[PDB]
Write a protein that binds this ligand. Structure first.
Ligand SMILES: [Cl-]
Ligand SMILES: [Cl-]
Ligand SMILES: [Cl-]
Length: 319
């Protein structure tokens, strides 16, 4: 096998693999297959099983999602990324068609080959960074005014945010067969189905200062646990209350009908949040229905923006 050495070689020369030694890519070489495609060619058809990912060396591709009612909704991406890795890890059927807009050169691997990549030095963080950059393009932070009169910016979490934050990861993602930590961790960073996190930032592109999440009690449950965090300087400023409003809009839109929570005696704040939905305490715990979108005290236009942001980010992460 001499191809393998030559393979490793081409791989090493990709932007994607900058700073890896060609030899250290030799096993991965054994697991990747080159692909060439012509303009117009389907690289991935909607309804296909998720069997492989593709690493594209060069060639612009076009992603579209066919809707049963009215024409397919379409988008470009430049090369240098991986496509199909979410569906692959989720074993879901593809929901979006992908077509070569330009001649396409690249590399196809299975899930084991993707796990190989995840373990190569530097590579898990690099993949998270590529995901973060791709997703940022689908986020417009929404300026929001908290009851203090301070302005912050509301946006879905991004891959890489340090607040995104193993056993908790499996106990969710239990539908991934024979998984690795690395596979679970990467899916965690790009998950907007089972997990939905809202972040509030100091300025439109500034640090996260608070966050709120729901975690469905199983892949697709209408019951979801909630948790809120608020940074140090920022307590008692109306923030968790606001985020809860964002969290309600997102739940409704994706069909989460119920919330549960539990934590410390100490943070009344959390009790006060659940309180406002008429919680039921039994360190303490509760369940509540998610109220109708009706009752979050935000302007209709803000409701539509939070829903569209929810829409866009889910759609980014649907392959
Ligand atoms: Cl891209
Ligand atoms: Cl699986
Ligand atoms: Cl580790």
């Amino acid at each position: 096998a001499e191809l393998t050495e030559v393979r490793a070689a081409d791989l090493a020369a990709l932007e994607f693999f900058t700073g890896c030694r060609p030899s250290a890519l030799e096993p991965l070489a054994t697991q990747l297959r080159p692909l060439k495609a012509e303009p117009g060619q389907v690289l991935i058809r909607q309804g296909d099983p998720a069997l492989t990912f593709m690493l594209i060396e060069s060639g612009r591709v076009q992603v579209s999602h066919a809707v049963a009612d009215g024409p397919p909704i379409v988008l470009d991406i430049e090369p240098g990324l991986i496509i199909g890795e979410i569906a692959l890890l989720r074993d879901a059927p593809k929901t979006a068609t992908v077509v070569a807009a330009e001649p396409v050169i690249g590399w196809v691997g299975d899930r084991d080959a993707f796990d190989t990549i995840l373990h190569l030095p530097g590579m898990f963080d690099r993949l998270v960074r590529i995901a973060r950059q791709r997703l940022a393009a689908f986020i417009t932070p929404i300026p929001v005014q908290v009851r203090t009169g301070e302005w912050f910016y509301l946006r879905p979490v991004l891959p890489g945010d340090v607040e995104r934050t193993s056993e908790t990861l499996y106990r969710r993602f239990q539908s991934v067969r024979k998984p690795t930590r690395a596979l679970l961790e990467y899916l965690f960073e790009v998950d907007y189905a089972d997990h939905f996190v809202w972040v509030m930032t100091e300025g439109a592109l500034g640090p996260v200062i608070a966050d709120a999440r729901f975690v469905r009690e199983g892949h697709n449950a209408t019951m979801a646990e909630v948790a809120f965090t608020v940074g140090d300087d920022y307590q008692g400023r109306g923030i968790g209350s606001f985020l809860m409003g964002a969290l309600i809009v997102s739940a409704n839109y994706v069909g989460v009908q119920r919330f549960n929570a539990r934590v410390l005696t100490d943070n009344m704040a959390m009790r006060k949040i659940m309180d406002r939905l008429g919680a039921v305490w039994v360190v303490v715990m509760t369940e509540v229905d998610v109220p109708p979108v009706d009752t979050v005290p935000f302007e209709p236009e803000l409701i539509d923006q939070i829903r569209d942001a929810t829409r866009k980010v889910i759609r980014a992460v649907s392959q």
